[PDB]
Amino acid sequence: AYVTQTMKGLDIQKVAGTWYSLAMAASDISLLDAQSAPLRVYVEELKPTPEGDLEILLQKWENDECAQKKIIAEKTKIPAVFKIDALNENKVLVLDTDYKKYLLFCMENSAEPEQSLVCQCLVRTPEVDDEALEKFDKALKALPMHIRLSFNPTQLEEQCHI
């Protein structure tokens, strides 16, 4: 039996700094495929507050060509569980992480978890890392899937630049 659901005993402030995307695996194609999918978010920064909330700074096309947003994830009870109110997922579970390496989280809705099941991994290094790839693949090999995404140095280099 594997163990990868509730991180627990995780330092909130430890996730304070700059982050990056490495891969994304959503159950719903329309959720993360094209047409500015809700899940389709180009995370860039991540830093929570001393209270317990988590500042999820993501960059998604809103109107001003690649706009940067921020979600104030509220606390519930367990550090490996947060509550948000923006995208198609209020629940936020923390799979795993290495503090100064990468982070693995999942999003779902109590109303339709399986329908809102989505997991992604964020790397601290400004570039892909065979570590975040294998692990994220080994941890997702046990859960469902539908659409995967693997950013590349070419695509990560720039985005909608002038």
Q: In the beta sheet, which residues pair with residue 25?
A: 119, 148
CA distance 15 to 109: 24
CA angle (37 as vertex; 64, 124 as ends), nearest 5: 80
Q: How far is CA 92 from CA 6, 43, 56, 130, in A?
A: 10, 15, 11, 25
Domains in the chain, CATH or no CATH each: 1-162 (2.40.128.20)
